[PDB]
Amino acid sequence: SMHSDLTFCEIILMEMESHDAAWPFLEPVNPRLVSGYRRIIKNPMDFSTMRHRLSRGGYTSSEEFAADALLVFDNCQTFNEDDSEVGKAGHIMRRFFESRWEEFY
Ligand SMILES: C/N=C(/NC)NC1CCN(c2cc(OC)cc(OC)c2)CC1
Numbered sequence: 001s002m003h004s005d006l007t008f009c010e011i012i013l014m015e016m017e018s019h020d021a022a023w024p025f026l027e028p029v030n031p032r033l034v035s036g037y038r039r040i041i042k043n044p045m046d047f048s049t050m051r052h053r054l055s056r057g058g059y060t061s062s063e064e065f066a067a068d069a070l071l072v073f074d075n076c077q078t079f080n081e082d083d084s085e086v087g088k089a090g091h092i093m094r095r096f097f098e099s100r101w102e103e104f105y
């Protein structure tokens, strides 16, 4: 399970999931709702996958956790236009994440 040294990451993820702009990213991109996603995006990532990986010991370090957070945002900018609703949400969430992370790094 998660080492207590990563509790600060657990909190950041909780706060991201609560954010207004988090809705596109809470669960894996859903083929019932979005077509052609995995055709373009080789390594999907989302906050529920991160939450399970973190809580069950699948991140050894904060760097691995942060890499998955950035993957959420990098995938979003690969798939979505910047002026789309989901594209805008990804930019908001990247800023929010980086602001929280910078309190530690
Ligand atoms: C600004 N905050 C939120 N949520 C907290 N916005 C969302 C965004 C749009 N929306 C939505 C979008 C869909 O796309 C296929 C399908 C769908 O089926 C239920 C719902 C739900 C509301």
Ligand SMILES: CCc1ccc2[nH]c(-c3cnnn3C)nc2c1
Pocket: 023, 024, 025, 029, 030, 033, 034, 076, 079, 080, 086
């Ligand atoms: C209402 C749930 C929902 C609907 C449509 C979505 N689209 C995306 C997304 C993420 N990254 N790219 N897209 C297009 N998440 C979504 C969540």
